[PDB]
Design a protein around this ligand. Structure first.
Ligand SMILES: [Mn+2]
Ligand SMILES: [Mn+2]
Ligand SMILES: [Mn+2]
Ligand SMILES: [Mn+2]
Ligand code: NA
Length: 327
DNA sequence: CGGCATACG
DNA sequence: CGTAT
DNA sequence: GCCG
């Protein structure tokens, strides 16, 4: 009843087991802070299974047979059902290690390995990081300088205003080029931590050199606070606000139209959905999937897709619209 | 036992 | 390493 | 942590 891959089942944005999935995702996050990507994946998968169930779980017996639910994840659910709280989860929640790792890794430019080094060096606050600016890359400095704004949820009004200015810069840089909203907002989310845009042109090859031209034109309009030939740009915008402005993270990607369905699929997510889809592709169908194409390593050929639907079908998967990819 | 998605900057 | 989904 |  429950397939093992997240790409084989609908996962809507609103589901019926937020309490259980949120607890399992704390353990997944903590597993990553300690350097166990395997444990992180399992806990993420178990949480995602609960998001795909049609009703709330109220008895431990409702977990029998579900993939990715073993002794550990079942004990967590069990404790939550009986006592409303899981000791392990609360221990992690309150721990200085978890709180400081979450604080540091939330910084744009800081990952687990960087945050772990700083923690081992005794650092605990953002001010501690500001004290010693020599130990900061230019990317981390931008992330730290705009951390407050970047912690404010991005709203749909922000998306619409951002798309207008991106579309204007793109149109000035290359007539006929298009801008597609991707990421969580394409999956139907009402908030987010950034905005993701995918850019192409209907005539293969015309998009060459586009992203630098777009960035220059945004910078000349005073819209760029930070950015780094390139096809992916992880920026921070200076988004006008009534009488003021706020910093917003914006990802711009350029793809040739031949790759557009694969880039759209990859950049629409969710993150777990794409990992599971790529694992399914390779492990179950012997095909290599990424945001550029779908590769057959035996024939040494690429699958010519015209749409996301074509990709799902070539993989033998029932099509899922973006709003059902919230694994 | 060993894998666990797969790229670009 | 960081980033992205 | 779970599973092929
Ligand atoms: Mn008990
Ligand atoms: Mn996003
Ligand atoms: Mn993004
Ligand atoms: Mn993301
Ligand atoms: Na980070």
């Amino acid at each position: 009843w429950m397939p093992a891959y997240a790409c084989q089942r609908p996962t809507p944005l609103t589901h019926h087991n937020t309490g259980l999935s949120e607890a399992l995702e704390i353990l997944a996050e903590a597993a990553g802070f300690e350097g166990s990507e395997g444990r992180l994946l399992t806990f993420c998968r178990a949480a995602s299974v609960l998001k795909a169930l049609p009703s709330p779980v109220t008895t431990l017996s409702q977990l029998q047979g579900l993939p990715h639910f073993g002794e550990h994840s079942s004990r967590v659910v069990q404790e939550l059902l009986e006592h409303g709280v899981c000791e392990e989860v609360e221990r992690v929640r309150r721990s200085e290690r978890y709180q400081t790792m979450k604080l540091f890794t939330q910084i744009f430019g800081v990952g687990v390995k960087t945050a772990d080094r700083w923690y081992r060096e005794g650092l605990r606050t953002l001010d501690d990081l500001r004290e010693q600016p020599q130990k900061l890359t230019q990317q981390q400095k931008a992330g730290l300088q705009h951390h407050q704004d970047l912690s404010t949820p991005v709203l749909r009004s922000d998306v619409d205003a951002l798309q207008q200015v991106v579309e204007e810069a793109v149109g000035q840089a290359l007539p006929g080029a298009t801008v597609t909203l991707t990421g969580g907002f394409r999956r139907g989310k009402l908030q987010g931590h950034d905005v993701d845009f995918l850019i192409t042109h209907p005539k293969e090859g015309q998009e060459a050199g586009l992203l630098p031209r777009v960035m220059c034109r945004l910078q000349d309009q005073g819209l760029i606070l930070y950015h780094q030939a390139f096809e992916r740009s992880f920026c921070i915008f200076r988004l006008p606000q009534p009488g003021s402005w706020k910093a917003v993270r914006v990802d711009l990607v350029v793809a040739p139209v031949s790759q557009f369905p694969f880039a759209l699929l990859g950049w629409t997510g969710s993150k777990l959905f794409q990992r599971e889809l790529r694992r399914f592709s390779r492990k179950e169908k012997g095909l290599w999937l990424n945001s550029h194409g779908l590769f057959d390593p035996e024939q040494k050929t690429f699958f010519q897709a015209a749409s996301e639907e074509d990709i799902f079908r070539h993989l033998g998967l029932e099509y899922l619209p973006p709003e059902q990819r919230n694994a």
